[PDB]
Structure formats: C-alpha cells, structure tokens
Symmetry: C3
C-alpha cells in the first residue's frame, strides 16, 4: 500500500479549523482517518506593510501568511477554494505535500466570485508550504499568497507548551524601504531578486514589541516556520538561543542543537526551543541586511526567574533591536496619516521622531542626547545645532567628519551618512531633536529635506 495507508475515512466529515498567524489549530487528537472539508477564501486587500506604508496584499483567508491548515496523514481532504467577488485576479492553490498535478493548482483555478473544489489524500506527513500558482506565479506569491499546511503523523506530534506560526517572505515595492504611501508591486525588483522588505508574517513589527510571541522559563515552544519566498533562502537563526530540533517538511532526518539553519525558498521546517533564561530572543534571516535593514526580525519574549549562573549581565537590547525595542512605532503611523490629511502638527513630528531616534541616533548620542564627552557630541542643548539648525539636514543625510567644537568641547570623529532615511524620517527625527532637551524648537519638514537631498 502507498504511504498513509490507514484505512477508509470513518465517522462524520470534519469541517476543518483554520487559524490566523501567529497561531496554529489544535492537534487533531484522533486515531482514525477522516474526511476533512477545508474552506479557504481568497481576499485581496490593502494592509500596512510598515508604519504609514500600505500595500495591496493578495491573501488566503485575509492574512499573510494565509490561514494555517492542520490534518492527519491518511485523511481525505475535500478542498474548497473561494475567490471573493471583490478580487480583481483569478487564483488557485498548490499545496506542497499533495500527490497530484500542480499540488492542486491544476484543479483549483477560481475566478472572482467563484468557488472550486478538488479532493486529495494526505499521504505524506510533514509541514508544507502552500501558495497560489496562477500566472504570473511570482507576482501572486510576492503579493502574499502563501501559508502552511501541517500533516500530522498518525500518533500526533509530541506535546509542547506553545505552538506558533511564522513565515518569511520577500517583498517588492516600487518605493524604497520605509517610503510612505500605497506602494505598488515592482516586477523589475522581483525578477532581479532585489526585495525592498523581507518580513515575518507580512509586516514590519508583526512579531515585535507588544506583538511578540510569549513563553515562560522552562516551557517548550514549537514553531512552524515557512519560507514563502518568492525568491530568498533564509539563513534562519535565533539570537541568544539554540534549537533543540529542526525538521524539514516530512523528512526522516532531524538535526538537533543548532542555531542557524538554511530554509529554501518554498521550504518549511518545524523547530523546537526550550526556554532557559528570560528576555527577548530574536528570529532573523542572518543574511544580516535583511534582518536589520529590511524588517526580517521577530521576537519570542520569555518571562520567569533569572539564572545568573547561566547568564549575568545588563539588558540594553535597544542597541540592536533599535526602533523595534519599543512596544510599537504607532507615532510614525499617526504622523503619516496626519501628513496625508494636511494636519501634521509639531507634536506629531516630535513623537514620530522619538520612535525613530531609538537605535538610529541613540546608539552614539544616547537616549537623552547627552553623548559622551570627547567621543560623541551632545544633541542636548547643542550650541552647534542651534548655530545652524538647517545644517543638521546635511549632517544626517551626508554625515559629518573632521574637527568641530560642541558645547565647549573639541571632537574629531566620524558620523556616517544616513542617506537611506526617507525625507519624512529625517524631518521627524530632527523635529524631535529641536523640541527636546532645551533645544530651540521649530520644525523641519519633509519638503525641506527633499530640497537638501537634491543639492549637488
């Protein structure tokens, strides 16, 4: 007999439990094969990919990644794909782990307002990516059409305290990283495999700050980790921790005691972690510019007792978490909305600048702007700043080096350029600085920065 040869479906049909990320459906907890009816609906919708940056996502079930599907090896799955009548595109589905043409894609082609169905036996146990397979396939996947399906072994997976759902994807916007507004898909960037964002669960900050995953010291955590791509291979890593186990798809091989593991485009793995020390543990793609310049960071926050014999030291994690150490960056979202409305206040800018100043500036100038005498000059009550507050725009954009004097102290160092910052970002940061620490006040606009950036 084939694999999953467990007998005919028994009992009543089961109408399947789908879940939204980062959560997983419960274990099926049964010892017999069932007929499982799955209903999944495609929805095309604008969502925020980053604070003040909107994108038209194409979704399975209203989320990126799509709704999580959980069945048992040997089940017969009757799959219903609906395409919402608001959709502009046709869609379909390819489930990895399906035995058949297109993994279902050949049978699930569904126009807006229609529904398709096909049936498959889940022969292969494992964790599997599913995704849309409608031409142009890459555009559909790039727009967010991917998720996971778990096919349990017949005895179920071992019990753990938490199960979570995390999926990486690469995204291609016409605009640059953190450029505000509704950003179109960019086919040229996509073909060249040059993403503007690389994210977990469809957005910057999806799993950071107040949206972190949780567990307690001593608890076990299983994460179902997908890589939807379309194009990147993840050097998937947990900062400050180790994986007890890493298992790809339905593979017989299991790797144990590793921290860094390569996930193919379209690949999926199950990882397991045991919490040992409190704090924030960071899931990243260790192709590091993805993690720290394009959004590829997610957090597991562990609460419980300290273990000073295992780890003893200070906890200044804003030095690397930067602007994602805080609970959120809602001040940026709000400043952007107010700017679109034409109602942007000085305070709107100050609070957005405060959020962005973390990491970006604070690593050298400190959270309080004091700097460090002789090494980093102060922004707090800075005579150099007050002498020519406009020149601060050039300093941020193009850097500063050479001998300067600030508040009666000599400096001879190097501030790197930060040209990657967008005009609103520079404007907001500088407005924050001007309105803090007894600086002269006033404001810098995005338009001011635009003019300075354009100077030869």
């Amino acid at each position: 007999k084939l694999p999953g040869d467990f007998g005919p479906p028994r009992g009543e049909p089961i109408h399947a439990v789908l879940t939204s990320p980062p959560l997983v459906p419960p274990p099926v907890n049964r010892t017999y094969p069932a007929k499982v009816i799955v209903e999944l609906e495609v929805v095309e919708k604008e969502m925020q990919i980053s604070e003040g940056v909107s994108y038209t996502f194409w979704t399975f079930g209203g989320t990126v990644p799509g709704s999580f599907i959980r069945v048992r090896q040997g089940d017969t799955v009757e799959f219903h794909l609906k395409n919402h009548p608001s959709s502009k595109m046709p869609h379909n589905i390819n489930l990895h782990g399906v035995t058949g043409p297109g993994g279902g894609a050949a049978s699930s082609f569904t126009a807006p307002g229609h529904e398709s169905q096909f049936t498959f036996k889940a022969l292969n146990e494992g964790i599997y990516v599913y995704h849309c397979a409608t031409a142009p396939v890459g555009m559909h996947i790039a727009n967010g059409m991917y998720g996971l399906i778990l096919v349990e072994p017949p005895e179920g997976l071992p019990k753990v305290d938490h199960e979570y759902y995390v999926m990486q994807g690469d995204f291609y916007t016409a605009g640059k990283y953190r450029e505000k507004g509704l950003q179109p898909f960019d086919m040229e960037k996509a073909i060249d495999e040059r993403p503007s964002y690389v994210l977990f669960n469809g957005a910057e900050g999806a799993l950071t700050g107040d949206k972190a995953l949780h567990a307690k010291v001593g608890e076990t955590v299983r994460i179902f980790v997908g890589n939807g791509g379309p194009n990147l291979v993840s050097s998937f890593h947990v900062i400050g921790a180790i994986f007890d186990q890493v298992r790809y798809e339905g593979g017989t091989n299991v790797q144990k005691n590793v921290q860094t593991t390569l996930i193919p485009a379209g690949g999926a793995a199950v990882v397991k972690f045991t919490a040992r020390v409190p704090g924030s543990y960071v899931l990243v793609d260790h192709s590091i510019f993805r993690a720290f310049n394009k959004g590829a960071m997610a957090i597991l926050k562990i609460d419980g007792a300290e273990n000073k014999l295992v780890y003893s030291g200070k906890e200044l994690d804003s030095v690397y978490l930067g602007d994602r150490a805080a609970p959120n960056m809602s001040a940026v979202t709000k400043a952007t909305q107010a700017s679109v409305s034409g109602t942007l206040t000085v305070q709107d800018q100050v609070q957005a600048g405060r959020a962005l100043f973390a990491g970006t500036c604070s690593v050298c100038h400190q959270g309080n702007g004091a700097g460090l005498p002789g090494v980093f000059p102060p922004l707090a009550k800075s005579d150099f700043l007050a002498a020519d507050p406009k020149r601060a725009m050039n300093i941020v954009l193009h850097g500063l080096n050479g001998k300067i004097k600030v508040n009666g102290q000599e400096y001879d160092s190097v501030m790197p350029p930060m040209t990657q910052l967008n005009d609103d970002e520079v404007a907001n940061i500088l407005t924050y600085v001007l309105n803090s620490w007894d600086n002269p006040g006033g404001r810098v606009s995005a338009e001011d920065v635009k003019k300075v950036r354009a100077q030869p």
Copy 2:
C-alpha cells in the same frame, strides 16, 4: 588502505560509454576494478537557448550539460580531453571527486586542435559535477562547460525503472530574457549574479512539452541532478510529488521524504521518485522567479490509471505551465527566422502569438478570448479593441485600470503592465488577437511596439 582499495585494474581496458542528456550510461554491472579510458571532446557551437534566441555555448561533447561519465569506485580512469580545432579558447577539466590538484584541471590544459591526458583513481563513490577550470573560470562555466560523473559503489546502485540526467545552470546574456537574436555573454551580469536565464539542460523548453521525461504509474525514477551554476543555489523542488530519497555527492547522509532541497552551486544530488498519479510533475528552482520568469522548469510526465482516492480534480495545468503546457513553441522559432529573412507573414505572427498567449493572456481573457462577463472583458469580437486597435499596444505594455465598457458591459478592474514582453512578442500576441474571433484583422509590427514603448 585508502578508500576504493579494491585491487589493481583487471581485464582489458574499457573504452567508456558517454551519454547525452537527459540520458545516463548503463550501470557498469561488474564486480572488479577496471582501467577505463574516457575520451571527451570540447566543442564551441551556437545553439538556441530559447525560441529564436541563439547563444555561443562552450560544451563538453556537444551538449549542455556535457556528456555523462559513469565509472565504478576503485577504477583507474585514463582521461583524454580533446579540444576541437574549431574552438577559439583553450579548455581543461576539473572533475569533482578526483583526488588531485585541480581535480585534473592542472593536467588537462588543452589548446584548440590538441589533446591532453591524465590518469586518476576513482577513490570516492558518488555523483559529482565536472566543469572547465580555465581562466576566466566563471566565463567558461557560464557558457555551459559542466556535466556529471557518477562513481558507483562497488555493488552498484539499487535497480530502478528509469535513470535521467538533469542539470541546472544560470546564464548571462547581454539582451533581456526572450530578446531575439545571437546573444553575447554578459560579464557584468555574471559578476553581479543577475542571470537572464536559469535553465535545465541548456535551453528553455529542453525538458517540457514533447521533450518531457516519461514514466508510468508504479515505476521508480532516479534523477542525477547537477547544479553547474556558475553562481546560483537551487531551491530544487518537484511540484505535486515528493522525493523518496535525496543524497548529495558521495555523502553518508541520505534524506528521505522531502519535496524541496537546496543544491549548492557546483553541487550534485541523486533523487528518487515513485510515480503514483498520472500527470505532469514539474522540477523547478523554487526561487520562483527563476522557475516562472527565467526558464527553470522541467517536466516528468506520468502515464497510467487514475487513482481518484488519492487525487480527484480537473486538469487545467496551463494556468501555471503557461506557454510551456503545449508540445512546443516552434511557431515562435519560425516567426523569428522569417523576421530575420524579411519574409514574416501575418500568419507567422498569428501562430507565434497563439503560442505566447497561453498563460500570459489566457489566464484572464480565456483561451477563446471570451473573458468572464463583468470580471474580465472579452478580446473576442471586442468593440473596445476595434475602436482603437493601436491602444492595445499601450494596454499590454503599461496595463489598464479604471472604468471601461466593452461589448455593452461595464468593467472596473486592473490589468497589470507587461513591460517585460519584448517588442516582437507584443506584436505577435496582438496580431494573433486581431486575427482571431472575428476581430478586424491587420497586424502589429515589432517596430510599432518599439515606438509606443519609447513614448514618455
């Protein structure tokens, strides 16, 4: 004793069986070590990399990938490399799995019209890439100079019903993807790892349509899978199926029951598949823009009985196979030749357009141009098209959105731009549309499209 310590060569020397892709030489079927004489000749030659796109390939044995070499662990191999006198470049060979300097490259340097020889013992069992290692090494590999050598274990590999030879490579043309004509190698793209094509066996469509690999339900298939690079790592995947086994090079580890596996640049693996359900099973690099935008798709076609208990659904695989669902795209080849000759007819364009319309347009407008009332507007007898057939060029290149009326029905949707299409492609597709379904006829030329593309 070293590995492969099986005794001295016995018997008469064996003059080795080389094969062209996608076929493999027979199992050596012997229990003793032999002296094996291998003769391989380099040939530089123009071949079609895509329909109407020529490239000057540099080849081992006249093909990309090069001729497959099959020996037994413990054999002594006397390797003769000839370089055809028509060659312009010198060449050599590095066989992975060889124990010695350059894997042979140090001893096989061969000018045009010359022959070299070196001898090695095959100590290491496994599947191995070989390639040219002549400066500039990357240019030689990019031009197609790679293949596989199998070193069998002494007892042979387990018997299977079919053995096939598939090798991925990344290619670098001065022109864009599907731009017609003789395309030079592009060193700048190659250094930047920005390929224009990513292919199996040296050409788009090498293993699709009427050139698919075959097997029957119940049969086992072994594929020797190489990645010649030069630069890309393949997220190697089979759509709608699973690999029973994946083994890299001569490694002791074997992974079982996986669908997606990472093959390094210069890597090789042996995969095994058991056919379970009829249909087309697609080998891809799941860095998806490679598979669906740059040519990285190959097909294994399985014939036999349906198994509706395992898979039950419709078979509309043109939705993802697109223009590669058909037996071939020879109409494109022919239209391109006629265009070069100055003898391009309306019918030449119509048939080339018909081939390209599959996937590219048919996913929304349907194979018969009818569209779907209220959702996708018709191209069949389209009053909107007839009203300004020229505007169709702008629609294809730059998309269309907003409210329009077509054949007495209102539409308010979005047709994405398709700027990646080349001028001949747009011209041919539109000529096909104009001459089908009682549309007004006439034709669009590549030159017409060029003018429209150049408008600001």
Copy 3:
C-alpha cells in the same frame, strides 16, 4: 539539569588563550569545568584588502576574522570587551552559542575607551560565529567584526595533525574590485547584497601563495570554517579533495564524504580532510564568480611523495589559480605605493604587469608571449603590437575579433573584452608586454587608459 551540567567551576580562574587567524588555540585538555576570563579588544584600523587597496576594518583583536576563542562546554566565561580609545564607534558582541539576550550583545555595549563585562555559562558544545551587534549591525559586520568561538565537548575533539581557522566574508567598497586607494564602505551595495570582494580571512591572497596553509601526505587537517557574511551563503568547496566530515555548529548530525557544502550567513562548520596527494588544494565559495572574480580562494598546500596510482598528470595550476599561483603580488602593492608618491618607474610598472599577466593573459598568449601559431597570436616581438602600440589599450578593454596578421601568420579568432581591469592594471600589463621579449619598450600610463576607456 540543563545541558553542560558538569558541576561548579573548580580550580583557579583561567585567563584564556586567544589566537589570530589562521591559527587556533590549543585544546583545553582538561576534565573539569573552569571559570575562564576572556579579554578581547576592539580596534578600528586601515589594512590592505587587496594589493594597493586599503579599507578601514573594524576588528576584534586586530584581525579579520577576530581572535579565536576556545573554551569547554560547562565552563563559566567572564567576558571582558574593551573598545580601544582610538575607535570612533561604539561596539558590542553577540556570541552564537550563548544562552541569553543578544548572545551577550545586550550586556557588552562599549564606547571608545571603555570596557564592559558579562558572564555566561557555555551550555552548548559546538563551533559558533561571534560578531558585533551594534546598530547599524550590518555595517559593523561588513567592516569585519566577526570571529569564531569553539566550545569543546567535555572529552575534547579527536586528535588531528593540524587545526586551522578560515572565515569567509562579503565586503562592500565604493570602488570596483581592485580599484586602488582607500575604499569607503558602500551601504547601497551592502543593502543590495552586491559585494565587491568575497574573501577568506579579510584580504585577497590572505591564504594563497606563501601564505598558504600546510600539511603533509598522510596527515589529518581540521578546519574551523566560519561565514561572517554579512549577507552571502557560501557553497563551500575544496578543489581536488573531499571532506571526511562536515559538522555544523553544535549539531548532532555529521555529514561524511562530501566536497561541497552550504554554509549559512552567520554559520560555522568544522571540516576534516586527510591529505592523500601532494599539491595545492583550493577552498572556494563555488558560487564561482566569487572564487575567481572577487577573491574567494584559499590554499592548503600538501607536501610529500607522489602517488601515481591515484593521480598522474602535469601540474600547470596557474591556468586556474591565475595571478594567485605565485608566492605573492607584492609588485602590485609596490607600484601602487610609488604611484601615490609620484615616483612610479617603468620597472615598477613592468613588475606589476608581470604579476597580473599570469592567468589573465598567459592562458592564451603563454607565459613567454609566444602564443600558439595560427591559434593565439604572439605578443613576443609582435609586429602587430609595434605597428600601433596604443591600439593595445583598446584591444584589452574592448577585445579583438576578425582577420588579422601577426608576424607573418593569419589569425581569425576572438579575444574577449576585459573591461573589468582597472586603468592601472591595463597600463601595467601593457608596460610589461612592451618591455619584454624584444618589444619596443616605452610605457602606458593609467591616465592613457582612462582616456581610451572614456572614448565612445
């Protein structure tokens, strides 16, 4: 108990042995857990990334990669990070394998002239990358802030004859590959993952020529192999040899008998090799343009007796090692310094050209400039060259094809363009050619080449 539950530290504290690449500290050779005090100092310093190309590296311990740290599983490590007062940036450290927030980064933030300390228990055996984790994290890593820490199993690793330390990194210069002078970090290239250099141990030629690693026939070699990134995944390969074992981080899985293995960004592996045949064995990233166009080649040189039954052939390894076959390229370094000083002589240029001519030109024109009658035309006493020595600049930059006559012999072949060569390189090569083999003498300057390159 956790992992590494071996008891409390015993004995006196041990002040740890750090080593500079390519060497490793000795095995700890003990059976009890210790308190180990580690002192590591950050130094920012200019070094040569390539001959005549300077870069401002940021280093742990004065080298790239940083000093190697070696402890035993179950040790308590008291980590002191100093930041030299000459530093312009703050720094910190994240050690993979540490159980705690940021792998230490949260507790080791250190301004110039300061010192930090934190303590951790080494629970996890394995080889691990460490790196700086100070915002912007990618810039710090790109500038060279990474190394390895080995956490031994309690019984120690098996004995071998040699242990070496090799770490790959990708680097991002404003200038192009081999463009001379002090090269700034290029943030735009880094974000796009488009490195100008890909190196082992921080420099082109760090481990080639007279800086090769050594062993003898019959000896075992262990290499601790890191990939610091920041961005690339290495298709890590040894030319002409095989790895007996490859083990990632602290993983339970060990792969045996492979030649090509994928190392994630931020990953580390221990590989083992047994020397069998004399010669030069090349460690490369087999994304081949990295290895042969961006510096990603290192050498293990094996001395001892020939084994003609295993490998019998000539040894012309300059065909692929090119300009790295020689002991060094010091003539390039010297010519560049003299050019900066305004004291560049004809002889300075001749010797620099001689070094660069290897591989680059010699593969076709031969080491003695004789070429091959009818196939490659001579540079030795070339009438074609003497007829218009200036035209040689265009020939190098833009190639040459078609019918020509040289020293009374007809040629009809193709010399590819070599536009990637920098102006000084072309000038030096041509000066070498003009002053060798009874050619007319004189010289070509970088400024001459610049003018020709700029012609339309």
